[PDB]
């Protein structure tokens, strides 16, 4: 009965990811970043996620992760901005960067 195994959308409960899918990009699954508007995000990298809607076409503008282009990732149920999908890079080609405090962790 593990209580710390799946991540859901904090706003609505949509299933998003799993602790097992955390990905240590450059040696750490956690990355702290800012956007051009100065908003700070504590980003958890995941190899895999579900339940999202990836919006529009990829962009390399202001990418936090060298060699990757991003798309906004919304909660596919409620529209909450949960993070970004990264693509176009190498080892891995793709991953998800999700905002830790916009997820809730709990049992499967």
Burial pattern 13-30, b for ≥16 Cβ within 10 A else e, equals ebebbbeebbeebeeebe
| Residue choice 64, 76, 77, 87 for contact with ligand EF2 (CB under 6 A) | 64
Binds 61: which of Zn ion, ligand EF2, none (CB < 5-8 Å by kind) = ligand EF2
Residue 5 or 59: which CB sits closer to ligand EF2? 59
Residue 35 as a binder of ligand EF2 (CB under 6 A): the answer is yes
* Residue 63 partner contact from Zn ion, ligand EF2, none using kind-dependent CB cut-offs of 5 to 8 Å: ligand EF2
- 103 in contact with Zn ion (CB under 5 A): no
**Interface with ligand EF2 includes 61 (CB under 6 A)?**
yes
Is residue 16 within 8 Å of 75, Cβ to Cβ?
yes
Contact 52, 74 (CB under 8 A): yes
> For ligand EF2, which is the closer residue by CB, 13 or 64?
64
Q: State how far the Cα of 102 lies from the Cα of 61, in Å rounded to an integer.
A: 23
Tokens of 78: 């409620």
The verdict on 80 binding Zn ion (CB under 5 A) reads yes
Estimate to the nearest angstrom the gap between the alpha carbon of 44 and the chain centroid.
6
Which stretches of the chain bind ligand EF2, using CB under 6 A?
Answer: 35-37, 61-64, 70, 84
């Amino acid at each position: 009965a593990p209580g710390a195994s799946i991540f859901r959308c904090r706003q609505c409960g949509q299933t998003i990811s799993r602790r097992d899918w955390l990905l240590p990009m450059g040696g750490d699954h956690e990355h702290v970043v800012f956007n051009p508007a100065g908003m700070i995000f504590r980003v958890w990298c995941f190899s895999l996620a579900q339940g999202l809607r990836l919006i529009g076409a990829p962009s390399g503008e202001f990418s936090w992760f060298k060699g990757y282009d991003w798309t906004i990732a919304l909660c596919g149920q409620c529209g909450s901005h949960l993070g970004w999908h990264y693509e176009g890079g190498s080892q891995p080609q793709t991953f998800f960067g999700l905002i830790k405090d916009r997820l809730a962790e709990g049992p499967a």
